[PDB]
Ligand binder design. Structure first.
Ligand SMILES: [Mg+2]
Ligand SMILES: [Mg+2]
Ligand SMILES: [Mg+2]
Ligand SMILES: [Mg+2]
Ligand SMILES: [Mg+2]
Ligand SMILES: [Mg+2]
Ligand SMILES: [Mg+2]
Ligand SMILES: [Mg+2]
Ligand SMILES: [Mg+2]
Ligand SMILES: [Mg+2]
Ligand SMILES: [Mg+2]
Ligand SMILES: [Mg+2]
Ligand SMILES: [Mg+2]
Ligand SMILES: [Mg+2]
Ligand SMILES: [Mg+2]
Ligand SMILES: [Mg+2]
Ligand SMILES: [Mg+2]
Ligand SMILES: [Mg+2]
Ligand SMILES: [Mg+2]
Ligand SMILES: [Mg+2]
Ligand SMILES: [Mg+2]
Ligand SMILES: [Mg+2]
Ligand SMILES: [Mg+2]
Ligand SMILES: [Mg+2]
Ligand SMILES: [Mg+2]
Ligand SMILES: [Mg+2]
Ligand SMILES: [Mg+2]
Ligand SMILES: [Mg+2]
Ligand SMILES: [Mg+2]
Ligand SMILES: [Zn+2]
Lengths: 108, 304, 152, 115, 102
RNA sequence: ACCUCGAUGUUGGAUCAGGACAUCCCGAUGGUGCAGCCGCUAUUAAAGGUUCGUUUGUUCAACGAUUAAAGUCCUACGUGAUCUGAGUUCAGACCGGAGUAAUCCAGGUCGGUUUCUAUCUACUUUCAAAUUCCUCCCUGUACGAAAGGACAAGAGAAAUAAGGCCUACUUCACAAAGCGCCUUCCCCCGUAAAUGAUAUCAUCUCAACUUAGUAUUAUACCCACACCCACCCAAGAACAGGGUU
RNA sequence: UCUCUUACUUUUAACCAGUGAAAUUGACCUGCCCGUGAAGAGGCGGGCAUAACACAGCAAGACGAGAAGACCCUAUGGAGCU
RNA sequence: GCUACCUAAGAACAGCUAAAAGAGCACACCCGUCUAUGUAGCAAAAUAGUGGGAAGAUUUAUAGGUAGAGGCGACAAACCUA
């Protein structure tokens, strides 16, 4: 089934400039209090999450280094310690992960 | 910017606010338990030709029911939940044939309602209701707004009409929508199994209005006429109606007296305006049965 | 019509769906925090809690062991489930996992979600937090709460 | 449910039913406005190369709860006038026939067992 | 035996005689019956040899003598499973191993 | 004022049907060579309905079993950008006949490819009014010499159609379905009669008029409107809708 | 296969992101009924209807689109065979 | 260099039954019966299933030959670079 006639620019404009076709303005956008970058509500802030993910990756690299090879998951809990930190009574009997940097403010 | 009620509330403020609003709703509902103690609208005796208000009930589900003759009838359970009279309109004001009562059912959140509706309910002093339905009544059947309605409004042996939105099947083809026979499976039939055949005639260069074509089926109001009331449970406000009513379970149905000409003037024995429990003349039992209904707790029936 | 259908259709079919979820769950047990498409994460979440329940049911239990053997492709994780994850949650009766929506994926613009087991060693997520009690609206309502409790 | 071209077991004393034949008796027609035949529905058979009326007495298809369901589709041969061809019915016969509209007294009389 | 309280079999001289007897008893029944009592149907009107009327507690069979002899309803109801005509009937047998012979 | 056989988007079927009345059935009447049951004939009526199978012989034909009846037609075969036999109709092949042959038949038989992603018009829950059969009563009555055998009114059972539903049963299993269950409401206008003039009788009246007569049916359904973060849903392609105390 | 169809899965689908064809197209501000035009009308006459725009279905019309046909006829046009 | 046929020198054919074969079942291999899909396609002839043959008038690689008034043909007017 082929078009019987060429559709005009007038009719085409009516189709493609319809509100239905148009991009809708978003009202979800707020400033993240932590970093000041824009976040959509209901969604984790991209900047803050990227920061957390970078740190998580570093810790995981260290975890892999200590484990050595595959199929070496520990049968005890894990704890991450930074520079100038010692294991506590709770941290005793846990796997210790050492980081070469200082504690982040957000990490508690 | 978009806002919801608990957007700006603290961790400890959310439970407090929830409790506060819930308690106020409970209080408002409890306030309206005695309409006769409050200044009522005049109660008139039943007359031929008169029509009384109906109810809004929730479809609980279905169970079997037996009769003394031995026949099994399936029944639908309709629970009456926070059913109140909301509004009265005179015939002149409505610009219609009859006076109207707006009646609401099934209380819902205040936070999820529009300001207009909230204001209306505030003036009433009742928590907002999910659905409001309009009942055409005579003048002598007028009830003061705020008056609660109960399942005992209906009585066993009475016939009712039930109206609800049917279960929405979404977009359906002709076979499920209109019961078109379709085309055979094998013996050719390249791409024709479930298709509509010839839509119209050759001579007309068009398709008639109201031709049966694929589209959205369900999710529309339908009325089931002449359903018998087998049983009332006064404690839980349950109406046992014969057969199946439209809609899914946990939906809201509009229940009124049967419009069928056979059951035109059988409203004589029924409580005319409504049933007022606070009247307290011959306090009704937990269960009201029809004569034919095999009551639970009765001895095993023998066909003598 | 799909009234009351509780499971998504994903992968190459029913078996494939199980296998996809199994891989996500194995990832979660190992890493304790997993990024994946939102729908897949939401589907897997239920299985995550159920697995902890079977973990709690006991190491010695043969039924729980069989389940754990199936759902964990890497076998080293099976001790971890029984000896680390299950003892961690012994106090609480549920809500073991935490799921949060993540900015859409770069390539395919897919809705994304992070899922973690609660009480993990990893750096805490930037979780959404309700407004402070010291805000103006919260102060007004605290006043109201005080007045109500004084009335009683 | 007995339709046209349904093989049928004759539960009767009649010579026509019980005599050996190469093919089983087959339903030619059902005397109901819809093709479907149930208990108490008169049908027409092709039996032993002749057309003969029969009455259905139980079938494989489930019905109302308390009503019995039979493993085989069972018929009783009847003449055009309505009297049974065979003298005795050994196979148990449902009691629902009595209340049903039609000439069921003859069949119940010649029946020996009820289920 | 869950059929009736009383089973009645009578003999008639002619078809016309059978009809006369069957119609009279139903006419007498209608006169004497209660309003709650359901109406009865004369069965086998077209049949020239057998008529039967079913009441609440009674079944009446009106049949010609030659018809009565072959059917022997008297024998069947007195002797439910011990009837002579039941003895000649042999139950069908499925061949063993589910393989037919000859 | 010769024997032909033509035609061939020609015609079947499926799907969905729109319409006409010149009515096949169901409604109401008049006549009868209408005692009653069946009929024959005409008037009015298109709301609803109008079956499943199979070809030994039959020039647009039957046969079997039914039915209330198995209507006659128009719609570009109604309808092939929804589908499908056969024929026109052929590329291969054989039989009978014709022709020296190639080849032909206005004869027979076997085998045999039409694709389409919808631009425009039109349309995509008008709805809320259902018909029919059988059984019983009347009644075995009226009627009739018998044989036979009603109509009104009422009751019960079904089938179909329209609209729903899932308690059971069945396909199955947070649910969707039928093979299951539930509900289904008004009439039709042709005539049959009073009183009574033109035409002091009579006369049902394209006289004024009076009844059967019902007229415009009617009633039912729907009907308030945050934020339009998000989540859930018995709501849904998207969108929209319902719930979030 | 059918009576008589149903349920589920996959593909497709629809929505979001990326890439991005083809046949087709006189111009179109592109309605319905009846009539006219030997049939046949969106556009002509007499009536009627009618804020405007998407998206998803449909195949009644646009003698819907592309070739390739089959039929009849014509050319002092060809060719193969006898 | 496709294809029809031929020439030279080659290669391939599991397993099972068989007095033992242009035998049977049945792989690989060759072909293309029937259906469905596809129809600007994966494809200017394909896919999936189902099929016919599969020690032979078999299938197939290499090199050579026959040329249009012609070749070649287990005649289908077949094939001779869509
Ligand atoms: Mg079908
Ligand atoms: Mg197909
Ligand atoms: Mg095709
Ligand atoms: Mg869903
Ligand atoms: Mg997928
Ligand atoms: Mg012509
Ligand atoms: Mg029609
Ligand atoms: Mg007429
Ligand atoms: Mg025609
Ligand atoms: Mg067409
Ligand atoms: Mg072939
Ligand atoms: Mg909403
Ligand atoms: Mg599409
Ligand atoms: Mg796109
Ligand atoms: Mg182009
Ligand atoms: Mg026209
Ligand atoms: Mg015009
Ligand atoms: Mg469109
Ligand atoms: Mg035009
Ligand atoms: Mg020339
Ligand atoms: Mg020349
Ligand atoms: Mg050689
Ligand atoms: Mg070999
Ligand atoms: Mg061989
Ligand atoms: Mg072989
Ligand atoms: Mg060759
Ligand atoms: Mg040849
Ligand atoms: Mg040739
Ligand atoms: Mg070439
Ligand atoms: Zn941030």
């Amino acid at each position: 089934a082929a078009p019987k006639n060429r559709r005009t620019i007038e009719v085409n404009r009516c189709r493609r400039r319809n509100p239905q076709k148009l991009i809708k303005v978003k009202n979800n956008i707020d400033v993240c209090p932590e970093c000041g970058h824009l976040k959509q509500k209901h969604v984790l802030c991209a900047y803050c999450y990227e920061k957390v993910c970078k740190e998580t990756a570093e810790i995981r690299r260290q975890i892999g280094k200590q484990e050595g090879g595959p199929f070496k998951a520990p049968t005890i809990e894990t704890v991450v310690l930074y520079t100038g930190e010692t294991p506590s009574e709770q941290d005793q009997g846990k796997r210790i992960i050492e980081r070469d940097r200082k504690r982040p403010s957000w990490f508690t | 910017s978009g806002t919801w009620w608990d957007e700006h509330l603290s961790e400890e403020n959310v439970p407090f606010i929830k409790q506060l609003v819930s308690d106020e709703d409970k209080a408002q509902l409890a306030s309206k338990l005695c309409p006769l103690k409050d200044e009522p609208w005049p109660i008139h005796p039943w007359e031929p030709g008169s029509f009384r208000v109906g109810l809004i009930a929730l479809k609980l589900g279905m169970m079997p029911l037996w009769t003394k003759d031995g026949q099994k009838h399936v029944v639908t359970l309709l629970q009456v939940q926070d059913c109140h009279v909301l509004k009265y309109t005179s015939k002149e004001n409505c610009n219609g044939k009859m006076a109207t009562l707006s009646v609401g059912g099934k209380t819902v959140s205040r936070f999820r309602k529009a300001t207009s509706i909230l204001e209306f309910y505030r003036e009433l002093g009742l928590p907002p209701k999910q659905t409001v339905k309009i009942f055409n009544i005579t003048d002598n059947a007028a009830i003061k707004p705020g008056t609660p309605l109960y399942a005992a409004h209906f009585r066993p042996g009475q016939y009712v009409d039930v109206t609800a939105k049917t279960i929405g099947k979404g977009f359906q083809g002709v076979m499920k929508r209109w019961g078109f026979k379709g085309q055979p499976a094998t013996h050719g039939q390249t791409k024709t199994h479930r298709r509509p055949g010839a839509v119209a005639t050759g001579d007309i260069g068009r398709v008639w209005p109201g031709t049966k074509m694929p589209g959205k089926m369900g999710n529309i109001y339908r009325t089931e006429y002449g359903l018998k009331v087998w049983r009332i449970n006064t404690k839980h406000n349950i109406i046992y109606v014969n057969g199946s009513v439209p809609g899914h379970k946990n939906c809201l149905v509009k229940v009124k007296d049967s419009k069928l000409p056979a059951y035109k003037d059988l409203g004589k024995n029924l409580p005319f305006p409504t049933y007022f429990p606070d009247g307290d003349e011959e306090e009704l039992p937990e269960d009201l049965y029809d004569e034919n209904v095999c009551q639970p707790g009765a001895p095993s029936i023998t066909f003598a | 019509i799909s009234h009351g259908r509780v499971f998504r259709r994903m992968g190459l079919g029913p078996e494939s769906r199980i296998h996809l979820l199994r891989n996500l769950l194995t990832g979660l047990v190992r890493h304790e925090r997993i990024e994946a498409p939102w729908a897949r994460v939401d589907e897997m979440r239920g299985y995550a809690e159920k697995l902890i329940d079977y973990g709690k049911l006991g190491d010695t239990n043969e039924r729980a062991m069989r389940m754990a053997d199936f759902w964990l492709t890497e076998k080293d994780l099976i001790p971890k489930l029984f000896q680390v994850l299950a003892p961690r949650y012994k106090d609480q009766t549920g809500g073991y996992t935490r799921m949060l929506q993540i900015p859409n994926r770069s390539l395919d613009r897919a809705k994304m979600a992070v899922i973690e087991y609660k009480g993990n060693c990893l750096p805490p997520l930037p979780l959404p937090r309700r407004d402070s009690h010291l805000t103006l609206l919260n102060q007004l309502l605290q006043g109201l709460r005080q007045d109500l409790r004084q009335s009683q | 449910a007995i339709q046209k071209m349904t093989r049928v077991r004759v539960v009767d004393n009649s010579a026509l039913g019980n005599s050996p034949y190469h093919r089983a008796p087959r339903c030619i027609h059902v005397y109901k406005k819809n093709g479907v035949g149930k208990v108490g529905d008169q049908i027409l058979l092709a039996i032993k190369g002749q057309k003969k009326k029969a009455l259905i007495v139980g079938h494989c298809m489930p019905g109302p709860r308390m009503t019995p369901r039979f493993d085989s589709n069972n018929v009783v041969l009847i003449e055009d006038n309505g009297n049974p061809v065979g003298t005795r019915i050994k196979t148990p016969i449902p009691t629902s026939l009595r209340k049903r509209e039609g000439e069921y007294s003859k069949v119940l009389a010649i029946a020996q067992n009820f289920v | 035996m869950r059929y009736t309280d009383y089973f009645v079999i009578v003999s008639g001289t002619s078809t016309r005689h059978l009809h006369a007897m069957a119609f009279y008893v139903v006419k007498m029944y209608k006169h004497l019956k209660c309003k709650r009592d359901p109406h009865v149907k004369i069965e086998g009107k077209d049949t020239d040899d057998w008529l039967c009327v079913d009441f609440g507690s009674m079944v009446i069979h009106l049949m010609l003598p030659e018809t009565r002899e072959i059917y022997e309803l008297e024998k069947l109801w007195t002797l439910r499973s011990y009837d002579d005509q039941l003895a000649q009937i042999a139950p069908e047998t499925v061949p063993e191993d589910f393989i037919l012979g000859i």
